[PDB]
Design a protein around this ligand. Structure first.
Ligand SMILES: [Ca+2]
Ligand SMILES: [Ca+2]
Ligand SMILES: [Ca+2]
Lengths: 124, 124
């Protein structure tokens, strides 16, 4: 869900508060987006937006209110590693990764703080 | 999901293997049921069958393949206590309890082993 995504950003980046740092950053990090990601760390976010985009299409899945952010799926973090349980059904397994790939991706991309709280519908 | 239900039966009854002991027991414990529960520990199972029965009706919920046993929902067991996270969405929150009430209920009901592997479609 939302709280696990964050909790996976800590797992991978034990140097944060993934609420402060990556929520409202550049064009796609945070809810929504438009324009071209302004960075690689924006790209991570853009791509994860598609990860969820795509999920909504699996006709096998029917996520609540229609925001996969609402899907609880059990994973476990250990030694800065992000594993994804397999007892996990297919819809939550899709999210697990949508969420796990960002956490990975993020830990490996330059954080320009000059893109945190960007003028969204302006420089987008 | 299935693996958490079990994992909650340990939480509440640290004296088991909730696979062996309560799967295939009396008429409702296990998959399906017919007849009147043969016991109180059968009643726990019957009632949980309705708990899931009911869940399928919440038009807000749409469970995979249509067996709420397939719903992962995060809970945490501590000091023989079964808590149910609230970061949990409403459909998985319904299951959490359907599952938590059995675990409670079970720990408090006489286990006749003379009902384990009962002639289902015979004494039902
Ligand atoms: Ca986004
Ligand atoms: Ca779930
Ligand atoms: Ca049953």
């Amino acid at each position: 869900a939302l709280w696990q995504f964050r909790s996976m950003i800590k797992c991978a980046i034990p140097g944060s508060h993934p609420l402060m740092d990556f929520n409202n950053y550049g064009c796609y990090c945070g809810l929504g987006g438009s324009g071209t990601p302004v960075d690689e760390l924006d790209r991570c976010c853009e791509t994860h937006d598609n990860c969820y985009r795509d999920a909504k299409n699996l006709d096998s899945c029917k996520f609540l209110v229609d925001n996969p952010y609402t899907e609880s799926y059990s994973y476990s973090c250990s030694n800065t590693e992000i594993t994804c349980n397999s007892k996990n059904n297919a819809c939550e397994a899709f999210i697990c990764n949508c969420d796990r790939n960002a956490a990975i991706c993020f830990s490996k991309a330059p954080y320009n703080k000059e893109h945190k709280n960007l003028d969204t519908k302006k420089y987008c």
